Amino acid sequence: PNVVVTRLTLVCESAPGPITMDLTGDLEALKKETIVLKEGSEYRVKIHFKVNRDIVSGLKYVQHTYRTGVKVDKATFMVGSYGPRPEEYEFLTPVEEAPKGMLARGTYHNKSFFTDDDKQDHLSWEWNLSIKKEW
Structure with a gap:
């Protein structure tokens, strides 16, 4: 296809290691993958x-x-307009603060869509974010 979604990354400097998922692989398996942020972390979705x-x-x-x-x-x-090239592009959402507090920890279930004004399903995928007191 012309547009291929390859990867999701949580960009957070304070993380002790990369936080990423390969979206060219088995999408059914992504739901089991452990994606952790320390509560209150500043991060962006890439x-x-x-x-x-x-x-x-x-x-x-x-x-x-x-x-x-x-x-x-x-x-x-809004992601916008992009031309063809061999190297992947990266889109980042604005920074947000992860939830914090005892009642805000645990599981957040995400469904993500990469699409366009023409409503094309470039990729739809599920993933779970786990908010923890420590990394």
Whole structure:
């Protein structure tokens, strides 16, 4: 395909190691993968993607976050226009603060969509974020 989503990374300097998932692999297995942030960490979501053949416009990243007892949190980010090249591009969301406090720890269930104004399903995937007192 012209657009290929390759990877999700949580960018956080204070993390003791990389926080990343390979989106070219088994998507069913991503749900079991442990993605941990220390509570209160400042981080950004980084989506890596390739544009292979043709200039594209209106790319968008959508993330739905499910947390027990809370209404689903829906966020849309404009990614924009990109031309073809061999090297992947990286899109980063604005910085956000991870949840903090005893009642905010544990599991956040995410469904992510990389799409565009034409509603193409470039990739849809699930992943879980675990918020912990320590790394």
